[PDB]
Structure formats: structure tokens, C-alpha cells
Design brief:
Chain lengths: ~190, ~190, ~190, ~190, ~190, ~190
């Protein structure tokens, strides 16, 4: 059956609901209260073929920060839940995607060990109304609850929207690869330490 | 039938036996007299899905060097034997794998022309009892007898075990890709110069 | 009895009311017209255990500046009033608090001599709608009316919200320490010059 | 009652058992297969007043790495279990400890968000038989499973044993502080977002 | 009973008597023949809550040096005597104190091993009639006879009196902390090597 | 009569016994559990003409560190005991000794004030199994308990064994000089401050 993870979490800052299907058809259904983040989550669905359902509300009058963080945390947990014991999966993903002049490499390992390597240099402070510092925080928080090893490398880029969107496209494709079935490994856990 | 290469070689320094199945199921069976190298050869099996059988003894009281070298030479020859005329294969492999903070890119071409490009900077001299200079030598010797074009690029890393292990994981996945069947090329040799 | 200081002040720019209990239970009740500042004043209450009541209105259509300043001035005066002759208190506070990658050291002396040492480098201009230059001004104004010696040192940090919030947490804990009873000094003024 | 966390975990690499009492009397009972790490865990007990019980076996013929990592992971989980919802605790710890010429600052926040800031520069590769790269890895792994924000800063030091031991002493004292009861906060969760 | 240490020493250069109560009430009673040093010893009493009795005479027509040194040596011995086997004490102290623009960190360990780390840069040669080189010598000599590990770090400062006085305040508070009872350790020696 | 100092000390880390004759005939009798240190202590005897008896056991499975330190501490105390009031001695020693390309200057003053000046740069981490950081620690600890002013200056050298051994030879000769009778001073204490 399809691998589906669901998470609901609320604090005094935010209220978040996430549902992700690893074996999806790219159904895009994200409403975070942060329009730019919604557009990015749509790439995750369109290019990763995940079904992505997100609802969030929160204290955006203070900052988009808490909302952004809590969405990311919940997505990471949903990924973790959907994955289980990771039997039969590729485990590793590696993809470099452009968007015009931008070029972003993502490599990830569904390892159970959280790590973010990140070197983006986004040259403007706001893309629309979205604080561009929140991109790093989105990935960091997602890593922390998913237990993913994730490296994001900026190889080229100038336009902030292009840089960020190329990142989400590359991430989506790398994550799709990692989560997909390995046709040769016959349902074994992809690790020497099992 | 499965592509299997077997090599036995002895000198006054070492005695080595290798058997590799390119079309394996990740059977790990390596005993070199060098425990760290055994752990690395296990990644080769687990992530490359090669069946890897290695037995070696040698003059480890002098150095792990001769053993390490002769194991690598024999593995390269076994790969060469298993491959044959390389009909119908992908030929090229390209994969970047992390292990936590380490990130290693491997690109290879089963070209018949030996070349190693290598830029690892391993910041400690011994990982366990294993001399970290021997990593480069392992790949160089393997290249020399297999007739492989191999590039290994350190993109990130600090922990020596992480750097080396990520290298073996990336190599395993790139080699798996290169050795696998190309579903479109209908048993032709993947070269313009045939 | 509990040490409570109350201040009301109005100008043509702003209208401010503050009530602070040094011996509080962390009651958070701040409405400044500046949502980010409200969130920071909540840390002051939650981590310092002060009861913090603030109401402010003002010329935010011009700038948050005058409001921010006048709130800070009034808080400083309220602290001064609540403290009195400082009999029996610790006087000095010293605490370093993180928020994720940010790490902020605050040291203060309830000396009667105003001084601010401040080296924060906040890498974005707006956190939500809040002008990040106003952080320094908040502490400067508070120091000026409280007669506090205050040092704020950025030891690490990248995310602007993390940097600022860690500052308020560290400040809250240092101020709590300084204002609390010294169990050994038997109600004496903590100074050699009395 | 005393806050006690217990963890047993085994892999093909290691076998680990940990029991930690947050409200201990400094009972030191650590046997990891890594003598230097045992000595460090004794400081954790002696200076933190934790009761620390650790048993580990593993593939030390390969490297101390896997053992070191798996001990740290299990300690982090044990801390997490012992802490619960963190009601009534100080939450934050801050301590700088010397050992002769070495001087190490540790600041931590029991936040639920893993982060390690670390800048130690240990000038030798082996302290006894212990690979000094493994110090960073111990703290990283502990952070990852405990969900702790941890900063370790080398302020002075030359002797590798002094640097590492001062780190464990400072960490022990900061962790003791963070885990202890806050006498004023009346069993409330020490956070504004509850 | 109160922990009191007394020392009398005379040479052809100086004549010194010291009495220190670790469990004091901040009784200040210092007359060294060096007025600035008397003022500093008063901070030690006022902020450390030590009872400090010092009488010294000596060859101040030559230099304040011998007097300064012999006072410090005798204070260190008095501390050592008052401390004994150090049963049940905190052992470690850590405090950073300002005086206006000056900010001085002191960390110390009552270890039995003398060490001074010191980086003050006092920008004038005489504060009143007191040679500012003698500050370092005071702490060095005190360390040498007390068997204390002591680190003094200048974090900020310009005015020489402020720098020196902040040092004595920070030292007093760190020493108070280190010498005080640890409420949890039940009269045990605070060391793993007992 | 011959000036003989004897010290026995034990901790949970080590057990040490030392006997030194200042007026010896170079009797070498050192067994520390650290073979390289034994060889160095033999130079002390052979070139200083001290009779040197040392027995030590300790936690060398952790590190040679604690043993090395505790031997040095005990030697320093033994020197102090053997010396007494230092009547009639040279007090000062000054010698520069080579060992092949290495050249080491030692100057010392039996002053009653501990100080180590040390600038050795030993270019390898292990001489045999001996951690070369422990050389500095040996001299520091010896100074701390003997109350000696000691300067060690590397004037030339490349081979680590040569550097360290030349240091012990120079030290032995300087210490011999300092401890020997001054034929002119007629049993007076060699100080202006008696
Ligand atoms: O968990 P896996 O499958 O990546 C295998 C481990 O040996 C990895 N590793 C992590 N640190 C040192 N080695
Ligand atoms: O052998 P192949 O299939 O890579 C084809 C050759 O033309 C490659 N080549 C090597 N040197 C110059 N060209
Ligand atoms: O006011 P206090 O208690 O800090 C004591 C003063 O001597 C401080 N001081 C200020 N400038 C020079 N000394
Ligand atoms: O979780 P807590 O108690 O530290 C309160 C949060 O507002 C912290 N925070 C984290 N990112 C931005 N703010
Ligand atoms: O004496 P303590 O209590 O600090 C414990 C010792 O292990 C310290 N140490 C000193 N050098 C190497 N380790
Ligand atoms: O003890 P002695 O014999 O070296 C004589 C002293 O005057 C030395 N001294 C130390 N500090 C300033 N002078
Ligand atoms: Cl690249
Ligand atoms: Cl600092
Ligand atoms: Mn955050
Ligand atoms: Mn777009
Ligand atoms: Mn070779
Ligand atoms: Mn491994
Ligand atoms: Mn203004
Ligand atoms: Mn916040
Ligand atoms: Mn690891
Ligand atoms: Mn130790
Ligand atoms: Mn002097
Ligand atoms: Mn003053
Ligand atoms: Mn030591
Ligand atoms: Mn020799």
C-alpha cells in the first residue's frame, strides 16, 4: 500500500496539519499562510510526485518564522512516519537542477541521522513577503525531525526566486529517488549495520 | 548468466583471492587482514549489490600497504574479467553520497583506459589501525588493473571515517550504475569506436 | 512585599503604561503596537519570571522608533522604582543563552550608572515588520533610565529572530539573577561605598 | 521520584545499554570498551551528579567510531526519556570550567531542537588510544537524540586531555544546572509557546 | 564551624599578617601600605562575603612590588589552610562582572594545581600610585600558594581602575561560588580521583 | 649527611614512590610504567649525579598522562624535601646541552616560586609510545611542587628523541649545579631577603 504519513501539531504560536504520500501522483494541496512557501511546496509535489497536503495557521503578525519552522518540523515527522524501517528503498538521492541561471545540487541520505549542509547565498532579503533566511530554517527543521542527511549546494544563481525554487526542485527529485523502491535489493534494509 | 570474475595471486609479500559477481545481491564476504578495509568492502557489497568475496594474508607487520595494494589489484582484475567486452552496459556511472557532514562525488567510465583523479584530504593519519594514505592507493591500484577512468571528489567532510566511507558508498553506487544493463542499447558496445 | 514599579508617560509621539513585578511568576501582558517586541517582552516574563504589563500606542505610521524607545524608557524607570535602594540583592547577573545556532552573553550590574556595551550584528533589516536597529535602541533606552551597566555580546548566530530572542532570554535570566535576593548578605546594600 | 532514563540498542556494529538518573548522587558506572571515554563519563557523573550506568561492546577492531557514536546516541535518548515534558526545570545551563591551562565554555538549552556549535581544536590525534575526532562526534550524536541545543567553545588550552576533560566538566555542570528544578516556576513548562 | 585561615610571614623585605573567613559576612579590614590594593581587597570582602583581615608593612620606598607579592602569597596560603580537603564544596567558580565599560571574566577551579591564565591589558602604568603590572603579580602569587587554577579574561575595558576593580569583583564572586557548599554532594570530595 | 627526599602518594588514578639523593653517585632506578620516561630519568641520574629511585603504577590504559603527572609532582616534592632551607647552595643553574642536532638551554633558580618557561616544539606526536605533550607537563608539575623557577629553550633540533633527551641532560646539569655547595658562601642562605 501507499506510504502515507500524517502529523497534527499545535502550540501557542502555530497550528499545523500535514499529510504526505511518498507513492503519490504529485497532488499539490498546500496552504501555510506563507504564499511563497506554498509555491515551493507545489514544486515538491510536481517534481517529486509526492502528494502534499499542508494546512497551517500561526503568528505571522510577529514573523513568518514560527509558522515556517513548525510546517517544516511536521513535514519531517510525516516523512519519517511514511518511511518506516526503510525496507527496499534506494535510500540515497542525488540531483542537480537549474532554474535559468540558478543551479542547485542536492544530495541526501535517509540515514536516520539528522544533518544539514547548506551554502546558499540568497542576495535579497525578501522574495515577495517571504524572509529568505527562512529557507535554511525550513530545511534544517525538516532534517531534524525526519532524521535525514541533507546537503544543499549553490553552484550558480543570482535571482532569489530562481535560487530557492531550483533548490526545491532539486530536493524534490533527490527525495523522490531516495524514497523509491530499489528494484534489486528485494525488500532488505539498505544498510550494512541492520 | 551472472557476470563473475575470479582472481588468485601470490607474491613473497601477500596471498590474495577475490571473487566478484557484478549481478549480485550484496553478499558481503571480505577478510583482508585489514579490518577497516573489510568494513569498506562491505559498503561496496551493500550499496553496489555486488557479491564480494575476498581473502588476503600478507606482511602486515611491515605495513598494511602491500596487502591493501594487492587486494585492490586483484579486485580490479576481477572486475575486468567479469565485464568482458562490456556489451549492453551503461558504461558510465555518476553518484554523490553523503555520510553525515562528508559528501563525496564519484564519476567513472568503464573505458579500458586507467585514470584516477583524486582530491580527498583525510585529516587524520590512522582510522582505527588503518593508514589513511592507503585509501588513494586502493583506488589507484583498482583503476590500474580494471582499466577504469575514475574521479573521486571531496565536496565536504571532516571525520576521516565519514570521508572514506562516503567515498566507498558513492563508488559502489557509481560502479553499480556503470555495470548495469542499459535497457535501450540492445547489447551493443557503448562506444563510437567499436 | 513584592517589588512593583509602575510608570505612565505620554508625549505628542506616544502613550505608554508599564507595570513590572520583580518578584513575579512570569505573567506576560505586553501590547506595544509592535508585535515582535511583544514576543520579546514575553521572553522577559517567561524566562525572567517578571510580571510584565505594558500598554503602548504611538506614531507607528512614521516609524516604530518612538514607540520602541518610549516603551524601553518606561520599563527602565519601572525597574528603577521597583528596585529602590537595592538592599539585599545579588546586584550582578551573568548568563549566556542560545537559541539554536545563536548564542548571546549578557552581563549586567545594577550599579546606578548607565552603560550599554553592545556588539550584535543582525544580518537582516526587518524581522517581520520590526526594524532590527531598534533592538540596540531598546536596550540603550532601558539602561539610560534604569541606571544599569549592561553588556550584550554576540558569540554566534545567523538567523535574526534567533539572535534577538536569545538576547532577550539571556537578558531576562541575567536580570532575574541580579534582582533576586542574595541569601547571605542580610539586607545590606551590595557595595563597598554605601 | 527520581528521573531515570534507560535505553538498550543493538546493531550489527555495537551493543549498548545506558541508564541515567538526572537526580543522582554521582554514581559512576561506565564501561564502553573505550577507556578514555569511560574517564570522561566519570566526570559527567562526578561533576554533574548524574548516576551514569553504561555498558557497550562493539567493533573496536575497525575503529572506536561506531561504539563511541552508539553510546552517545543512547545517552541522548536516555536524557530525553528521563526529562519528559521538562516541567519545572531551569532548562538552560551555562558554565565555563578550566583544567589547568584549558578553559572550555558550555552553554545549553533543553529546547527539543538539536544543534551543536563546536570549535574545539585538539592538537593531537590520539589521547591514549582514543581518536580525538570522536569528541565532536560524541556531542553531536548526544545532541541529535536528546534534542538539545549545545554550544562548546574553546577559550584556552594546549594539552589534549585537558581540553577534552575540561569540556566534559563544563558540560556536566551546565547539564546539571539545566536539568535541576527552578525553585520559582512552580512546575510550569519553561517556554512561552506551551 | 567557619573556615578560617591565618598566616603570618616576615622577611627582610616585608611583614605580613592575613586572616580570611570563607564563611564570612564581608568584613573588610585590609591595610597593606598600598591604598589601591586595600580598595581591591575591600571588593573581595564586599562581593565575595569573605571576612578579610590584612596587615602589611614593607619596603615600599624601593617598590610596592615586594609588599604586593608577599600579601598575595600569604592570602593564597590562608585560602589553602581555610579550605582543607575541600569536602562538600562547589570547587568551580565562573563569573563575569562589569564596571561600566569594563567587563572581566573569571573562571577558577580549586584543584590543588596552580595555574594563572591572564590577558588583561591595562592601558596606564599607574592607578593612583599603584603600578598596574602588580595586578598580574598579585593573582600569580595568590595562585602559587593556594594551588588554584585561575583564568582572568578581559572582554572589554578602557579605564584602568575599572578594569582592575571589575577583575576583583569577578574574582570575588567566582571564589565565593567555588568555596560555597554544594547542596547535593553530601560532603564528598568533588573529584573523580579521591 | 646526604640530602635525601622521599615521597609516597596514591590516588584512584596512580600510585607513586620516589626517593632522590641530591648528593648521589648517579644511581639510576626508575620504573614508571612509561619506558621513555624511565630513559629520561636515567639521564637525570647519569648527568646530574642524583640517585633516582622511582616506582609508579597507574591508569596507562586511559592515557600515560596521570602517571606522568603524578611522577613529576612527587619528584618535585622530593626535591623540595631534600633541599630544606637551601643553606650554602649555588641556587642557580645554567646549562646548554646538545644531542646531535638538538640543542637545549636550561636555566633554573631554586627560588621557592614556581614558574615554567617552555618553548619546545617537538615535531612528532609519539616517541615510541610516549605522547610528546607530556614532556611539558612533566616539567610543569615538577616545578609546581618543587617551587622552582625553570626556563627551557629549544635552540635547535629536529629529532623528537634528541630534543627531549637533550632537555633532560641540560636540566640534569643545571639542577646539579644549583643544588651543589657554593664553596664561598659559608652556609648562608643565597638570598638578599633572608
Ligand atoms: O548507518 P549506515 O548504513 O550508514 C553504516 C555506518 O557504518 C555508517 N557510519 C556512520 N558513522 C560511521 N560509519
Ligand atoms: O573510447 P571511447 O568510446 O571513449 C571514444 C574515443 O573517441 C575517446 N577518445 C579518447 N581520446 C580521444 N577520444
Ligand atoms: O559603586 P560600586 O559599588 O561599584 C564601587 C566603586 O568604587 C566603583 N567604581 C566606579 N568607578 C571607580 N570605582
Ligand atoms: O521554543 P522556545 O520556548 O525557545 C520559544 C520560541 O519562540 C523559540 N523560537 C525558535 N525559533 C524562533 N523562536
Ligand atoms: O584532579 P581532578 O579532579 O581535576 C581529575 C583529573 O583526572 C584531572 N586531570 C588532570 N590532568 C589530567 N586529568
Ligand atoms: O627571593 P630572592 O632572593 O630572589 C629576592 C627578591 O627581591 C626577588 N624578587 C622577587 N620579586 C621581586 N624581587
Ligand atoms: Cl561540483
Ligand atoms: Cl567569551
Ligand atoms: Mn527557529
Ligand atoms: Mn516560480
Ligand atoms: Mn605501493
Ligand atoms: Mn562505518
Ligand atoms: Mn531615538
Ligand atoms: Mn520566537
Ligand atoms: Mn559516524
Ligand atoms: Mn584526567
Ligand atoms: Mn616578584
Ligand atoms: Mn573603585
Ligand atoms: Mn594534567
Ligand atoms: Mn636516548
Amino acid at each position: 500500500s501507499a506510504r502515507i504519513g500524517e502529523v497534527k501539531r499545535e502550540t501557542k504560536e502555530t497550528n499545523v496539519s500535514v499529510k504526505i504520500n511518498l507513492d503519490g501522483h504529485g497532488v499539490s494541496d498546500s496552504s501555510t499562510g506563507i504564499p511563497f512557501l506554498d509555491h515551493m511546496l507545489d514544486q515538491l509535489a510536481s517534481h517529486g510526485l509526492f502528494d502534499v497536503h499542508v494546512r497551517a495557521t500561526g503568528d505571522t503578525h510577529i514573523d513568518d518564522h514560527h509558522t515556517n519552522e513548525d510546517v517544516a518540523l511536521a513535514i519531517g515527522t510525516a516523512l519519517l512516519k511514511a518511511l518506516g524501517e526503510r525496507k527496499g528503498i534506494n535510500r540515497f538521492g542525488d540531483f542537480t537542477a537549474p532554474l535559468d541561471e540558478a543551479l542547485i545540487h542536492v544530495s541526501l541520505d535517509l540515514s536516520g541521522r539528522p544533518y544539514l549542509g547548506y551554502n546558499l547565498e540568497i542576495p535579497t532579503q525578501r522574495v515577495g513577503t517571504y524572509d529568505t533566511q527562512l529557507v535554511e530554517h525550513f530545511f534544517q527543521s525538516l532534517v531534524n525531525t525526519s532524521g535525514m542527511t541533507l546537503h544543499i549546494r549553490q553552484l550558480a544563481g543570482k535571482n532569489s526566486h530562481h535560487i530557492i525554487e531550483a533548490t526545491f526542485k532539486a530536493f524534490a527529485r533527490a527525495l523522490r529517488q531516495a524514497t523509491e523502491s530499489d528494484p534489486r535489493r528485494g525488500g532488505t534494509i539498505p544498510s550494512s549495520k541492520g
